Structures are given as C-alpha cells and as structure tokens.
Amino acid sequence: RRFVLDTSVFTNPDVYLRFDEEPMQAISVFLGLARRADAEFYMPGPVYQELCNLRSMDLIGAEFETEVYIRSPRRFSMTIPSEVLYEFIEEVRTRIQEAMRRGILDSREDIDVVLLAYELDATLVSADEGMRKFAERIGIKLVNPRYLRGVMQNLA
Amino acid sequence: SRRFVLDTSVFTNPDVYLRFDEEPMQAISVFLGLARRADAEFYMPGPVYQELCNLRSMDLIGAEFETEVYIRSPRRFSMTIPSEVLYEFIEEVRTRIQEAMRRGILDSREDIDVVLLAYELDATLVSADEGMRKFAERIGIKLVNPRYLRGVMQNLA
Amino acid sequence: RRFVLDTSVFTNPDVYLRFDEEPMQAISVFLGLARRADAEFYMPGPVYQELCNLRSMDLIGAEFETEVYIRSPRRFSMTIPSEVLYEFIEEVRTRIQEAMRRGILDSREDIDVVLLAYELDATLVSADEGMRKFAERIGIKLVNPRYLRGVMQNLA
Amino acid sequence: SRRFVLDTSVFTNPDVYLRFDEEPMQAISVFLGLARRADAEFYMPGPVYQELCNLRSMDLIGAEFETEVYIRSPRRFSMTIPSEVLYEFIEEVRTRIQEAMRRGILDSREDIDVVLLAYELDATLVSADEGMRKFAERIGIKLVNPRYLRGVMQNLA
Amino acid sequence: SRRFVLDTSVFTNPDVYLRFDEEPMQAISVFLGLARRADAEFYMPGPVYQELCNLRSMDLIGAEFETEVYIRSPRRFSMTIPSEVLYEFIEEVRTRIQEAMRRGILDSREDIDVVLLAYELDATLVSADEGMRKFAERIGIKLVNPRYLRGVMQNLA
Amino acid sequence: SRRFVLDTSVFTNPDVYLRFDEEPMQAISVFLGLARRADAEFYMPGPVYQELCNLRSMDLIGAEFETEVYIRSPRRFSMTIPSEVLYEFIEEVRTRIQEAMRRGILDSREDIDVVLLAYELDATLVSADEGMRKFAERIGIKLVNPRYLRGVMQNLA
Amino acid sequence: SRRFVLDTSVFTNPDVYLRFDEEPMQAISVFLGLARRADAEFYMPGPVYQELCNLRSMDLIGAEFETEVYIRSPRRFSMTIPSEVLYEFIEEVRTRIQEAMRRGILDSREDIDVVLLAYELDATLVSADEGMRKFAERIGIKLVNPRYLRGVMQNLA
Amino acid sequence: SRRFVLDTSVFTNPDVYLRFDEEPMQAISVFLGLARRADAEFYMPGPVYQELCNLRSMDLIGAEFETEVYIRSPRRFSMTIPSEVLYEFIEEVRTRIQEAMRRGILDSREDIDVVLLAYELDATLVSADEGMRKFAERIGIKLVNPRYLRGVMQNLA
Amino acid sequence: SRRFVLDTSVFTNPDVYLRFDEEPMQAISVFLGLARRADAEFYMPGPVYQELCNLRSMDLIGAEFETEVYIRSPRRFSMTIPSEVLYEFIEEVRTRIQEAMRRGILDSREDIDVVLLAYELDATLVSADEGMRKFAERIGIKLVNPRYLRGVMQNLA
Amino acid sequence: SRRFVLDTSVFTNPDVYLRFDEEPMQAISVFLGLARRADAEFYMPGPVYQELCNLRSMDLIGAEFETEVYIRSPRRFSMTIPSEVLYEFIEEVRTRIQRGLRLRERYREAMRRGILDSREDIDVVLLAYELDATLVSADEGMRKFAERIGIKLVNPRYLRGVMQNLA
Amino acid sequence: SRRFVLDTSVFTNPDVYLRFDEEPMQAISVFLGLARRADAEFYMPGPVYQELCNLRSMDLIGAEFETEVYIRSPRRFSMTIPSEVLYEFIEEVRTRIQEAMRRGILDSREDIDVVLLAYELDATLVSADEGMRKFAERIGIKLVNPRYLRGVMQNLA
Amino acid sequence: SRRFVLDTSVFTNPDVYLRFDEEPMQAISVFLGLARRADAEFYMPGPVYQELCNLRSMDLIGAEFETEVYIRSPRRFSMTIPSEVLYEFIEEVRTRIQEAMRRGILDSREDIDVVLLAYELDATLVSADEGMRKFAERIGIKLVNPRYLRGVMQNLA
C-alpha cells in the first residue's frame, strides 16, 4: 500500500485541521500515525522544498525524511495516454483564475505529483479538487486527505 | 509518398506566405496547384482547417482544399506519447506568457494539435513558429524550414 | 485500449440518446462505430443475457458477438482490497430504494462488471452514477458513457 | 497460545450462552474467570463490543473484560481478501433479507466484521450463527461448535 | 487476433450444425469454407478430433480441416487453475449421471480438455453443451452462442 | 512444528483404531490422550468432521476432541492447484465406480477437502484409504501410514 | 504465419512419403515443391537432418532442402519444460526397450529434440511415430496427421 | 532450518551404513537417535520408502522412522525443471544400458524423485549413488558426502 | 529500403568529401543528385544540419537538400539506451578536452544525437569521426565506411 | 527493508561529517554505531570505497565498515537508463567544468578531478537507480541530477537523525 | 525474409568458397552478384569484416559489398545469453590451446561476435568452422551447410 | 540473512589464511568455529570444495566443514548472465596467459563457478584473487575484503 502526498495535506484547512490544531504539531501527529502504519508515503521533491520553505525545520525534518520518501518520479520510461495532455490543458485554463508564475508552477507541481502516483501505482492524496478530476481521468486512486488520518488509523 | 503536416503558419505568417503569390487566395490556390502534382500526402488538423476558413478562406478555396489536403483528426485518443512532452508544453506556456490570455492558450492548443498529428503520422512538420520548431525538434519529429516549402513542391516532381 | 461495457450504456438515456433515436439502430450504429476502431469491448455474461432477452435479437446479436467479447469476470484467483466490501456495503445502502430481488441482482451485475474492469485494467463505461463513484473509490479508469462515442470517433 | 475470535451470539444468543450461567452478569464474569486461566487469547471487534455494551454490559465489569479480551478492529485497510468473497456475501445477503431490511444490513455488516477479523488473525472463530458458521467454513476459518465453548475453556488449563 | 475453440457438438449437434447446410458433411465443408476466409484462428483438442474423425469426418475433408483448424490439446501442465474449479467440475460429474460410465468419464475428459484449452489460450469457447457452457461462463471463458457461429464468420473477412 | 491432517477413515476403518484401544469410543479418547501431549497440531476438514459425527461423536468426547483438533476446511477459495490434478481425479472416479455412484460422487467432495487441506498446510496426511494415499503420493503430500499413527503420536513427547 | 516441425519419419515412412510420388527421393523433391508455394515455415532439428543425410538424402536435393527448411535445433538452454514431462518421458523410454538399447537412447534424444522444438515455437508437429504423437498430444503440441500432409501444403498456397 | 533429503542408499550401501552401526537395524535406530536431536528436517521420497520397507523395515522401527522422516514425494506438478536437465537425464539412463532394463528404468524413476525433491525444497541431497551426486552437483543441489553424515548430526544438535 | 544517417563530417571532412567533388557546393549538389535516385532514405539530426548550415550551406541548395535528407533529431524521450553507453560516453568527454570548455560539449551533443538516431531507426551510420565509428560499432549500430558512400549510393539504383 | 546509498561526501564533507562527532575516523565509527542497529541496509559502491580508504579509513575500522556497509558496484550490465538521462548528464558535466574553472595546470587539474568525479558519481547514482534505494550525498550537483532522474533523496544534514529514529 | 549471418570463413576457407568461382576475388564478387538478387539480407560483424578487409578485400568491391552485406556488430547490450553458454564457450578456448595464444583468443572473440549476432537476429549462421557449427546447433542457431551456400541463394531469388 | 560465497583462496592464500591461525588445518578449524556462531550462511561451489579436499581437508575437519559450509554448485541452467559478461570474461582469460594453459583454463572454470554462484545468490563473494575481485566488481557482485574476513564474522555474531 503506497500513498503519494501533496503540499495541500499540510496546508489546506479542514485537511490540516482534523489532523491537529497547530501546523508543526499537525505534521508531528501525521508522523506519529506513520512510523507505525504498514504503508509508505512518497512526496515529490519540489513539494518538499515548497513545504520546507514554509515551516519545516531540522527536528521535524529528521522524522519527516525518515517516514516520507522524498522522490521525484521516474521521469521517463513512463508513458501517458494523449488524453492527459489535452485534459491537462483545461487544468491550466482553470489555473489562470503575478498570477502566471504561481499558476504555472502549481500546474507543474500538480502534474509532477500525479505522474509520480501513476508511475508507482500509488494512491494520490491532495485537497485540491481539479487535481482530483485530472487524476481520476488519468486513472489514479484518490483518498480525501480529511479521511487520510482516518486511513492511517485502523491501518496501524 | 512523403507525408507532410501543415501548420497554418504557412498560410498566414509572412516570409513563408510570400514566394507563393502576392495575393492570399492565389497563394493558397498555387499551393494547391503544386499539390496533387508532387508525390506527397498533405495532412492538416481539423481545427486548423476550420480556423483557416474563418481566417481567410472561402468556400471555393475550401472545396478543392479538402479534396486534395487531407484534413485528419490527430488521433486525440489512445495515442501513446512520451512523458515530458507535457513539460515541454509547460515550458512553452512559460515562454508564451506575454482576451489575450485565451488567445495564447488556445493557440497553444492548436499548435499542440499540429505537433501531435505529426508525431502520430511520423510525417514532416512544416511550421514557421520558432518555439514550435524547438519543441518539435526535441520531441523527435521531422522538420522542414517552410521558406523552402515551395522550393520543396517542385524538386518533388 | 480495452473497455468494459454495461447495460446502462444501451438502456439509460443520456447514453441511450445521441447514439441513435431508434434503439436497435442505436446499438447498430454503436456496432458500426466499433468493428473499425482499435478498442476491445467486454460485457459480462449475465449483463449480456439481460440485454438480450429484452431488445437485442437475432438480427443484430450476431454482429454484437462479432465485436463484443462476452466474458464473465475471472471471479476465482483474484484479490481485491478489503475496504471495497464496505464500499459495496454502502452501495447496497444506496440501492435499498419486490425491489429486493432487483436491487440484489443489480448489485450482483455491478460487481461482475467492476471486477471484470479491475482485472482487465480497462476503462469501464456505465450510465449509473453510483457505480461511477464506486469505481472511483476502488481505482478503475472510468469514462462517461457519453464520452464513449467521442472516443469511438477519433478511433475509426 | 491458541487464538479465539468471539461473537455477539456467544454471549447474547442463548443455546451457547447457557452452560455458563443463568444470570447474565454471573455468566459473563465466570467467562472472565475461565479465560486468562487458559492459554488462549480472545479478540472481539471494537464496534461489536460497543453494541454489546449497548445491550447488556455495564462499566462495572468491562475493565477486566478489556484486560482479558482484546477489543480490536480488523485491519480493514490493506487487507487483500479473495474477491469472490463478496459474491457469497450477496448470497449471504439473500439468506439475511427476511423497514426490517436495515436491521438485516446491520447484521450483515457486523457479521463481516467478525469474519474478517478471524480471517486476518487466522484464529478459531466462535459463533452460534449457522449462517456465519457456514460462511466461515467456506472461506476457510477454523471453527468450534460453540455449545462446547466452556468445554473448550477447560482442557485449555 | 481472435481465437476460437471448438467442440464436437459444433459438428455433431444440429441447430448449430444446421444453419450451415442440411446435409451433414457438406455443412462441415461449408464451415471449412467460412473459416480460412475469416480473421480468426480455430483450435480443437486432440481427443475431440479423434472422436469426430471416428464419427463422420473422412479422408477427403480431413486435409482442409487440418489446414485451418489447429488440432492441439491443451498445455496440459504449467496451467494453474483456481482450486475450486475442481469443486465446480465435481458438480458436473454430479449432474452427468444421466453401464454407460465409460462414456460418461470419457465425455468428462474431452470436455475438460476443451474447457482448459479455452482457459489457457484465453480463446473463445463455442459449444452446444449447455452444461459446459455454464461451467465455462462461471470460470471466466469467453463465449459465443453457437447459433450465431456461422453469422460470426461472415462478419470476419 | 508438526501438522497432521486426519481422515474419518482413521477413526472409522476397523484396522487402525483398534491399535489405539479396543473400544472405538475409548479409541478416540486415547487418541486425544496421546494428543494434547505431542508437539503436533491436528487439523480436520469440516465435512470429514461431520461425517465422523454421523458415526459416533457425542458431547463427552466432543469437547476435548474439538479443543485439540482444529476443525478447519481447506482454503478452497484462493488456492491454485495444478491442472493435471483435475485430470488425475478423473481416474479416481474410475476406481470409485463402486446405486452407490451418488455416494461415490459425494466421496470426492469430502475426500478432496482432506487432500486440499494438506496441500495448503504442507501438512502430514494420515488415511488408511489406499486410493487416497496413492493420489497424495502422486500430488506431493507428506504421508504417514496410519498403522503406525499411535507410535508417531507416542514418540512426539 | 504457420510453422511446421518435420521429422525424419515424414521422409522415411513408406506411409507418409507415399501420398507423394513413389520414388522416395523424388518424393522429397515434390515435398519441397509443395513448400516454397505454401505459406508455412518448415523446421527440422539439426540432428534429425544429419540422420536424414546418413540414411537417404544427399547433395543435389540437399541444397534446395536447406533453402526452404530452417534446419534449427531447439533452443535448449533458457527453456522450461514442466517437470511432469520428465516422468511422462520415462513412459516413452520404457516402451522404447525394443544395436538394440543404444539405438533406443539415440532415437529418444532425436525425438526429444523434435518435441522440444515444436514446444518452443508453439509450432505444429508432424511425425509418423505413434509414440511421438501420443507424447505430443499429452504435452500440448499441435498435431497434423502425416497421412494428410500433402493436402495440408495444398490449400496452403 | 536445515533440510536433508535421503536416498535409500544411505541405509543400504556400507560405509555410509556401517559407520552408524554394523548391523542394519541398529544402524537405522542409531540414525533415528541422532536425528530428532539434530536441528535438521529429514525427507525421503515415497517410492524410496516403499523400496526400503520392502527390503528391511518392520513395524518396530517404522514408528520412529516416520516420526522424524517426512516421507514426501516431489511436487511433480507446479515445478518447472530447466530443459537441458532432461538431456542430462538421458545420459544417466544412457549409462544404464548395461530384467535389468526394467529394473534400471524403475531405479531411474526413484532417483529422479529424489533429485527433484532436493531441487524443489532446495534441501541438501545426501546419497551414495555417485551418478546421482554428479547429476545433482551439475543441476545445482546441495551435497553432503554421506561418509560424513553421522558427523553432521552429532553437530546440528 | 535502407536508411542512412548522415553526420556533418560527411560534408565537412574533405577526405570523404573530395570524391563527390572538389568544391563543397558542387559536392553537395552531386550528393543531392545521387540521392532521390537511390532506393534509400537519408537522415540528419537537426542540430547537425544547423551546424552544417553555419559552415557552407546556403538557401540555394537547401530546399533541394531538405527535400531528400529528412531533418530529424532522435526521439530522446521514449528510448532506452543501455547503461554502459553512458560510461563509454564519459570516455568521449574524456578525450574531447584539449575553444576549450564548450567545444567538447558541442561535439558530444551533436555526436550523441547522431548515434542515438542511428540506434533508434536501426539505420546505417555514415561518419568520419573514427572515435564515433568505434563507439557505434561497440554499441551495435550498422556502419558504412564513408569512403565508399558515393559508391553505396550509385549501387542503390 | 529501507535501503540507503551512501556517497563519499557523507564521510568527507563537513556539516554531515560533523553532526556525528568531531574526530574524523571516530565520526565514521559513530556512523557505524548508528548503523548495525538501524533497520536500513547501507550500500556504497566499489571505487567510492577504494578512494575513501585512500583518504581516511584504515584497517582498524575496515572490519566493521564492511560488516554493515554492502560494498556493491552497480549492476552496470542489464540495466537500461532512459535515453534523456545521457543528455541530462551532459548539463551536469556542463556545470562541473565551470566550477573547476570558476596557473595553466592549476585550472587544468580541477577539470581532471571534475571528470573523474563524473565517473564515481555516476556509479553512485546508477546504484541508487537500480536498487530503488535512497541516495544521500552532499554534492548539490548530484542531488539535482538525482532529483531530475527520479532517485529517492534524503538530505545528508539529517542523516544521523535518519538512523536514529530508525531503531 | 531470410536473414543470413556470414563469417570470414565463408570467404576464406576453400571447399565452400570455390563454389562461387575459383579465382578468389572474383569468387567474392560473384557472391555479391548472387546477393542483391536474392530475397535475403546478409549480416556480417564489424571485426570479421575488418579481418576480411586486411586479407584480400579491396576498394572496388567494397562499395558494392556494403551495398548488401550489412556490417553490424552484435547488439552486445540488453542481450541475455543463457548462463550455460559461458561454460560452453570455455571448452572452445580449451580446444584452442594449439603469438598463437593471442591469436586463439582473438579468434574466439570474433567467433563469439558472429554467433551472438546470429542468436540476436535469429538469422541463419553460415560458417565452415566445424566447431562453430556444433556450438551453434547446441545453443540453438539456425544453420545452412556452407557447402550449399551458393545454391541457397539461387532459387532464393 | 547475509550470505557469503567462499572460495578456495580463502583457505589457501596467506593474509586471509594466516589471519585466523598459523597452520592450515587449525586455521580451517577456527574459521569453522567462527562460523556457526555468525549469523551468516557460507556457501562454497562443489568443484572448489573438491579442490580444497584435494589440498588439505580430511575427515575430522570435513564433518564440521560440511555441517556449516553449504557445498552447492551454481544453479547453472535458468540463470541469464548479460552478454558482455562473456566478453568481459574474455580478457580475463587474456590476463590468465601467465602444457601450462590447462591450469589457466581450469582456474577460469572454477572461478566462474564461484562468481556465478554469488551472482545467482546475490551473496558477498569473498576472494583473494585480485582478478576475481575486479571481475566481480564490474559485473556487480557484492564484495568484502578477505583481509577483513575474520573481523567480519565477528561483529556479526
């Protein structure tokens, strides 16, 4: 059982919430659910750099890197149906909403994560819903990160 | 039979529009005359053709143009493309940052149509778009500088 | 590419429609759109039988089996994750709606088609929304029954 | 170190409840005494314990009941049971149909809880339900005729 | 391509044997004609062929039959059937009761050869035995109602 | 450690139980006495158990006979026997020709569970049935002549 | 296309080179003529070819023979026969007791080459040996009766 | 643990026989004393045990012998030997060209049971048959010079 | 039809290039004449063609040249080179040192485009970089001595 | 199990060399002590080991070192790197020659070391590629290369805290 | 089509090479004459071609030579021989005990080039080196007795 | 756990011979003592062990030696070495030039026994031959310096 995390897991309210009240204590409680769960959690490297730019520090980072595999996808030898590209175009549209940089980098981050999930045949988890629609049309299992903590529980 | 994939740049953008005719309708007609004589199969994505009709073409143009230029859908479904083609698409959009935004993104959509059609048929892409040129050069699609396209019509018998 | 069909594709409107106004010629134009493409269509045995008794007869059925493989899912020697069953539980909930036999049998053919798609790793098609959400939770490539023609065109 | 998985029917349904005692608290307490003297480990699904506490159990005794019996939920995620199981689920669903259908569905849900915990731990299932006993025999769970459950408790020293 | 596995019923039992021709051997020859013009391969296991050749097929037709129908017995080995398949097969021997036990067991042997062949090749079983057809359906064998068999070969060309 | 799969023939066949003791009920009792002291585990299929219960079993023995014998069915669901086994089973029906044919067919089911159970556990099969022991020897099951069963129980201490 | 695995019996058995012309070498020649117009590919394991040269064939036809008959030995290493074959193979060597024993061993090696080639290619085997055909019919090789070989190369052009 | 596989030779051929004890039966008895104190599991193919029990064993020793010797034939099915083995095998039967022929073949079947069992368990093949030792060394089986077998159970204990 | 893959050294390096002609434009022209008459196809990576266009080529010949020589760069994405190539590749960067920092990387980018394109198309590499020819021979690319290139075109009709 | 692929930088570059202990060899020793208890398996290719031995490690640690560090070279043969890697590799090799420069033999020698690092680094990265293992190294160039190719990464700053918290 | 893999012996050793023509260089030239008119394509490894080039081959034929004899070396990566080949190969070096030892190892490298190329392409190795042909039969390469090679190309036309 | 493929040099060459003890037999015995206390399994190919047994080992040491050092030969068949291993192996024999070439050939055979065994098992090949170490490094075998071997078995208890 393999899971593919996303930055929204530790950023989106009611997803960050329902984990814990404090940010770093929320990551710590996720860590506590991990290190005991039978599953393994992957997180693409750019997402890790994004998160570490916000709040992560050495003490919490040690646990986080022990429990979450920091891995970018096997960039190549992975082959997507043409669907994705055309489909992905629409995603970019929905992310126009100073805007261009963050929107395009966010879309690249989205594709990076969903590609990792597709490669590993793992379950992507992410709060953002356009990501969900894309990932279901490309063919990846999704778990609502609100219920992800419910999943780590009962999986320990 | 040496298959070509026609991007609409050859019918609009200058420096490749010229050397065919001074007049756009006669440039299209003379390109048509060079077609059906050279041992070639010209392909064009459907949206490109309909836009061309809305851009400049009229019905007398379009009838003969369809009769000789194969307007074919780029197998938009179940085509097995390699991964980073999407990342080159993102890098293109990053370079295509510049009502205006919608035109940019939809132009990107059409250009991707053309490139994917060429990739699928392995045909030779002809295009004036330099960014599309680098993207197609990296993806692995046969390229032609379209300033030679008329120069390719004859010399192709 | 591989697809897994279901009776809704030929019974429920919104996929009954836009194929053809006449039902038998709707199936026939679906047949003609196939018989040319590169995709393979499967249909579990009971599903096909329920379809056949009702509307499809000797005039069209020969063609139907010339293009569509009738195969019950390889029930035996296959494993599904346990949580599926509560998923199925909840599906039975959504089918509580005389109706006892209809609901139980419909869930029966539901799992027939779902497991066939899971084994073949194909792209399920079905009009019923509950089955669509079930497939999303289990992790099946699922496409809209109306999008199915739009896929057939651009394949033939 | 023999492992046992209990059931609602063990305590609540008579005909297996009897041969322990007639006053329910006395029988549950003598069951507590019989266990933890034997070399057995007892498991009981969590929600099943909660519903039992809703039926008869009181907080006076549960402390020792939670010392000897493990109130554990099944590893219901990441557990990969044979797919066909669900098929006879539906078969079983039929044999449980008889607004009472919601009660039947709750019964089915709890029965699956117990059976899946036993399949996870490979323990000896105990349950008075011939419906659940047949299912456990088919899927491959160790069984015990629960009328001999006390007769099992002794000889387990 | 598409693969078919045949049974002696296809060439012995009318109502699939008709729809080809009234006179039997000519119906065999007509099926020979329809195959080799279709885009499918046809397999038919060893013992079944021995039985059918004992019955009606003669030296004249045998040449074409072996030209287009691979007389091959299933891989006999290296094929791991699901365990309960055996149990299911028992049920057939349960229902095949009808001094004719030699015939009964030989029929069971030919039927299991045919079904296992259709299992190994993942081919399409065609047969008039309703008992075998339900077994093949439940195990997961691709099926074709033989009353449509001729109709299939026209639609493949 | 050491696992044994019984047959109800062991407690039923006249020749082998008497070595436990002259009284068949006392034979079962002394078998239980030898068990519970050996380092071995005893499994028995549900069908074989209930066929035995149709012979002699009552509560007095039944308690301990079910404590130190796991009445467990093979994991019929989700196990992969090899194909030739099925073919072999056919020839057993050739030996099981034995009015009585119905019983013979039921024989298969109960009998097959034993073998399957062993195959699943890689256990040690005990059965006075010559046909069963031949089938097990072909299929690859650990075997022990039941005439020595007592001694094998005796030495485990 | 279609692949045949010949055998030295096809040219050394009076039964099989009849149905070609009586002159046996010229029967080989007409066999070659039927090939090169058939849509098949005809293999013959190398030792079998050496045997055929030792007995009967020679240069003048030999050139054409090698043109159209891929003299290829089975890819012994990196091929996995299921183990039962070996016990099966024992049968053959047994019934190949029959100057006497060394010839039996050598023939057994030639026959195992032929059968393994037809097994590896999933080809069709032809041979006049009843033993070879029985062994192939068990292990799962395609068969074509060598009496009907001429008619099989015709209808195959 | 560590698993040995015994050929009957270790109880027949002196120097791997007398080293335990000069008399046959006390030799077997002291071997059984060494085992069941060693930390190894000892295996013997069924036919080997039949062959021995037809030579010397009597119901006295048989108890302990079947206590600490898993009598197990190879899982012939669901085991895929590599092809070239078979040719290997023939050479061994080749060497047995030397009544004797039928005995030679039966010995070959027993020997191949021993070797395939050792291959399947990846156990340690102990046997005095130098031909068997060479064959198993080539195929890749663990080996113990049976002259040291006694020592190997004084250790491991 | 053969596919040839051209390296810019074919036109630059006079040693290969004098035999077409002594003046570079006329030599390109005679090469163009030789092509379009051969049944072969000629390929050139886009970067290599650009580096050519910088040196001597101009618009006059370009068209005709670009009609006959397909300008395409290797499909970098969706290609799986083997690992030792990469280590081999370092050796090239090793020797490409000696105008200093960037010339070597330019050389290696063009060279690896060419070699990988030949690998992808399974075409025939024509080049004068003796190091590149050794590298292509090792990796497994076809080779034509460029000294003979003119002949190899004349002989292709 | 979890699998780590070391790089010699871990045992030469400070700020991962420290954070274990002060003394060099005793820093190696404390790293080993954190290993041999951790659930992970530590790989470190052959030539990397040779050079590390030539830098600091001597025989007094060697027994322990080879006890819990699988000195294994990448299975070069029978491994297929996707094509673009070779181009990507270019740019990484493109950078190292610039940091070699940015007096004749003085800048000449740095190029030699860069292009030999270009071989040791490729062994390490390919081992991590093949095993699907986690790559730890201080070379930001290697880290960015592995980020692009898709190797499991771990900051060597946390390496101690990774073998701690790993039993 | 019918791929052949040549060898230096085919053009050096007599008795195989006169059959084209007695005068050596013209014998090679008429070999090329037969080629280019056959429906066969002739590979030849790089080292072997260069070894031929040192001895006799000259400039005029060279052109025509590379017209049809594809000079390609075995893919040598991502090709997985079966392990026994290595041991097999040892004996060849053994038989090449026969300066001379360096010559022996160089010849062994060239021969492994040829045999591996034929193994990879599944082409038909042709070579007069008797040891090489025995090795090729064992490993499983097609073969064509080179004494017939001239014939093998005529009527292959 | 942690598998070590030993080698004859481990018990023949000082500096891995001497680090356990001074005299040969006592060094073997103390190595044997260190093993059986390590958590590591120690294989040794059959031919290598027979070579050692030729050199020094006798009954007294041999019993223990075979108790704890598995004497297993590589599973030659069904192992797929990648191609250039063979080519790599080539120059190893080159470097083994050193009447006397027979020793080099046999050394090569046993060395490939050891290295292949380690490759198959994915063990930690210990060896003193620096050529073997280099070859095993390039191919991708684990390694530990035999100079440290004693220490490695300690620190591992």
Numbering used by the authors:
A (entry chain L), C (entry chain A): 2 to 98, 131 to 189
B (entry chain K), D (entry chain B), E (entry chain C), F (entry chain D), G (entry chain E), H (entry chain F), ...: 1 to 98, 131 to 189
J (entry chain J): 1 to 102, 125 to 189
From the paper:
Ribonuclease P (RNase P) is the essential endonuclease that catalyzes the 5’-end maturation of tRNAs. More recently, a bacterial protein-only RNase P, associated with a single polypeptide as small as ~23 kDa, was discovered in the hyperthermophilic bacterium Aquifex aeolicus that lost the genes for the RNA and protein subunits (rnpB and rnpA) of the classical and ancient bacterial RNase P. This prokaryotic type of minimal RNase P system was named HARP (for: Homolog of Aquifex RNase P) and identified in 5 other of the 36 bacterial phyla beyond Aquificae. HARPs belong to the PIN domain-like superfamily of metallonucleases. Homologs of Aquifex RNase P (HARPs) are also expressed in some other bacteria and many archaea, where they coexist with RNA-based RNase P and do not represent the main RNase P activity.
Here, we present the homo-dodecameric structure of the HARP from the γ-bacterium Halorhodospira halophila SL1 (Hhal2243) solved by cryo-electron microscopy (EM) at 3.37 Å resolution. Hhal2243 assembles into a dodecamer in a left-handed screw-like manner, with each molecule being rotated by approximately 58°, except for the interface between dimers 1/1* and 6/6*. Upon completion of the single screw turn, the first and last dimers (1/1* and 6/6*) encounter each other at a slightly larger angle of 70° (top view, left) and laterally displaced (side view, right); they cannot form the same inter-dimer contacts as dimers can form within the screw turn; the steric clash between dimers 1/1* and 6/6* terminates oligomerization. Hhal2243 consists of a PIN-like metallonuclease domain into which two helices are inserted that we termed the ‘spike-helix’ (SH) domain. The PIN-like domain is formed by six α-helices (α1–α4, α7, and α8) and four β-strands (β1–β4) that fold into an α/β/α domain with a central, four-stranded parallel β-sheet. Two Hhal2243 monomers align head-to-head with their SH domains consisting of helices α5 and α6 to form a dimer, while two SH domains form a four-helix bundle resulting in six spikes that protrude from the dodecameric assembly. The dimer interface covers a buried surface area of 1300 Å2 and is mainly of hydrophobic nature with two clamping salt bridges formed by R141 and E91 from either monomer, respectively. The covered interface between neighboring dimers extends over 900 Å2 and involves the long α4–α5 loop of one monomer and the α7–α8 loop as well as helix α8 of the respective other monomer. Application of this method to Hhal2243 revealed a stable dodecameric assembly of 295 kDa that included 98% of all molecules in the sample. Our Hhal2243 structure supports the prediction that these residues constitute the active site of the protein, including an almost perfect superposition with three of the four active site aspartates of AtPRORP1.
